[PDB]
Assembly symmetry: D2
Homo-oligomer: 106 residues x 4
């Protein structure tokens, strides 16, 4: 139960990254800074792995959470440069998951 | 929003399958009917893929949800034969996710 | 060993779909028919799950392989409409994996 | 092409970890030191993510490869304590993938 807050934060960050992925693929004219798409995919995959590792009580919980913190920091810093509302929600959820994973792993 | 109930049910089924995986790996003397472990892993992986496909609005949402319904039916039918409380919770969450995916895909 | 040809074909299809994903994200002016990007991601994920299910001898091998056949048929039919060489390689690997999964599952 | 050797080594390590998972779940009387099963699952999942990140040319290639090196070192050190041939093959593939990921990331 000591990682449940980080589990719920990473599930919300998964949902925000997948929503930003889909709503960036729907729009066409901006090109949405395609590193945002690649980073949203890699952030959703590392957050899915972090949820899987925290829910299974793995002995590599802190290292996966530190890597997820780094990827979430980069995904938030790249998605915050956009004007769309889904990208701002993705950046806010990524920074929340990043500060949660940095406060978790020590 | 028309698949959000199935998304939350599959996230609860992911958590229940991973918890049954970990608590079946912790105990030693029963051997916990190792098909339960393999089916809990495959059910958690197909439910993670189903959550990823429903959150990304994929064109193959119904087929992944029907496969997730079949795997959740089998995982519930195999985990319901056990006396442990985590296995009964896993079976109840798997049957809830199974009836949700069967009511969803049509 | 009776699914090893399908395992190697799905690994080659994973590599081709990820390469088409990356080389579609690199180019900017075409927009690369963003359904190609979404289908390449979903095809790489279902082929990773199919490789995981065939390598673990799961009881749901044929259903995952039939779903992988459907997704590979759709990804090949959508990537074959493009002029880029990586998209043509992705379409050829997807149709090879599709005919291998359709000849496998029966 | 500068990570293709690590990609093939991680694919062989995925196959060895999944084979050790399945052949540890088949046998019953040893109990196969269930941390071996959990570590084989987590090693196969981090190696699948490392293959996905190296095949997609992600900007977080070195960090995922260093985490995969740590998990492969631990999985090899835990699987080398067993007498079964699949566990020894899993340990040899894990140490090969570990030295490849440690020679790769710098």
């Amino acid at each position: 139960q000591y990682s449940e807050a980080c589990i719920e934060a990473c599930i919300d960050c998964m949902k925000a990254c997948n929503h930003c992925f889909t709503k960036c693929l729907e729009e066409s004219v901006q090109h949405h800074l395609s590193g945002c798409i690649r980073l949203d995919r890699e952030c959703a995959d590392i957050c899915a792995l972090a949820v899987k590792a925290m829910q299974t009580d793995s002995p590599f919980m802190k290292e996966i959470c530190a890597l997820c913190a780094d990827i979430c920091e980069a995904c938030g810093t790249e998605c915050g440069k956009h004007d769309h509302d889904h990208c701002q929600a993705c950046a806010k959820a990524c920074f929340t998951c990043a500060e949660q994973c940095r406060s978790m792993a020590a």
